[PDB]
Design a protein around this ligand. Structure first.
Ligand SMILES: N=C(N)c1cccc(C[C@H](NS(=O)(=O)c2cccc(-c3ccc(Cl)cc3Cl)c2)C(=O)N2CCC(CCN)CC2)c1
Ligand SMILES: *[C@@H]1O[C@H](CO)[C@@H](O)[C@H](O)[C@H]1NC(C)=O
Ligand code: NA
Ligand code: NA
Lengths: 11, 250, 28
């Protein structure tokens, strides 16, 4: 339901 | 938040969202108390009866947000956690006594129109403001009823006399808690709810016009039930632990 | 933490939010 946060924040 | 309303832009620039990485979901509210420290409820991070035990790498904090679900490009900032500190006498076994925790960010967050820290109360400010009848303000992206809001919700609620708090529940109430809400007769209503935990109960000093965080959303029996009241961690009573954590690990 | 509790879009510009007066009025 949440828009994907930038990939840099997952790495 | 139940029976609250849409927050205004920048109305609560210390509001923090605790965000679970996988799966991506809202965990809890929280607050920004400096450029590196975030305050929340201990139970948001540690609750053994439901097998909840989050480590730093499990979570992100999202600061400057207004929309619950949208990635607010150029507005919100997302920070990683360097270290979690839970009150050593946090009592998850019985009544959530000392429901408090600190989170140190890996790097300082930049302040802005939408991101700014709340003050923590001194003794005099607590003594002056924490009185039955005095209203504080609660904010969060939690449930709208006992279903999820598009944007940050806000509600103002009166502090309740300690004996009324005690008499409303079977839970043993400590000096490290206070409760807030309207009485059934009073007409108006409103309460925090699931998902709002860890968020701030704030008051605006009429002495220096600053916002102070007096409480952390801790627990309630249902949400907005007549004759029930939301319970909040008493931040001033735990300030010595907060200072100690920040002094030692700053 | 010395500029705490003063909101950029409100206190800093001396603009009030829609319901803060409700708080002040409770502070008797
Ligand atoms: N209304 C508010 N102001 C209110 C404020 C914050 C949250 C919520 C929703 C929920 N309410 S609940 O009625 O559904 C519920 C359910 C199961 C146990 C308890 C409970 C836990 C500890 C204690 Cl001392 C007392 C109680 Cl009654 C409560 C609740 O209080 N929590 C806290 C513990 C958390 C556990 C960590 N994930 C789950 C969500 C509501
Ligand atoms: C919670 O987390 C730490 C690390 O995961 C762990 O080693 C501790 O025993 C865990 N469980 C608790 C506090 O119940
Ligand atoms: Na009781
Ligand atoms: Na109630």
């Amino acid at each position: 339901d949440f828009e994907e946060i930038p990939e840099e924040y997952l790495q | 938040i139940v029976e609250g309303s849409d927050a205004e832009i920048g109305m609560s620039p210390w509001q923090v969202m605790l965000f679970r990485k996988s799966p991506q979901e809202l965990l809890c509210g929280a607050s920004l108390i400096s450029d590196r420290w975030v305050l929340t409820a201990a139970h948001c991070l540690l609750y053994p009866p439901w097998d909840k035990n989050f480590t730093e790498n499990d979570l992100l904090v999202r600061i400057g947000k207004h929309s619950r679900t949208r990635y607010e490009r150029n507005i919100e900032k997302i920070s990683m956690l360097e270290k979690i500190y839970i009150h050593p006498r946090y009592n998850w076994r019985e009544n959530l006594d000392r429901d408090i925790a600190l989170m140190k960010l890996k790097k300082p967050v930049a302040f802005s129109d939408y991101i700014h820290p709340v003050c923590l109360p001194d003794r005099e400010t607590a003594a002056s403001l924490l009185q039955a009848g005095y209203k504080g303000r609660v904010t969060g992206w939690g449930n709208l009823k006992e279903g999820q809001p598009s944007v940050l919700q806000v509600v103002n609620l009166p502090i309740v006399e300690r004996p009324v708090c005690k008499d409303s529940t079977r839970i043993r109430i400590t000096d490290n808690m206070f409760c807030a809400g309207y009485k059934p007769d009073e007409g108006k209503r409103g309460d925090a709810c699931e998902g709002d935990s860890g968020g701030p109960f704030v008051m605006k000093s009429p002495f220096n016009n600053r916002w102070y965080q007096m409480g952390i959303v801790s627990w309630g029996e249902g949400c907005d039930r007549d004759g029930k009241y939301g319970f909040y961690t008493h931040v001033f009573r735990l300030k010595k632990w907060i200072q100690k954590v920040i002094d030692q690990f700053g | 933490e010395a500029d705490c509790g003063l909101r950029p879009l409100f206190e800093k510009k001396s603009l009030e939010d829609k319901t803060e007066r409700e708080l002040l009025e409770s502070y008797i």
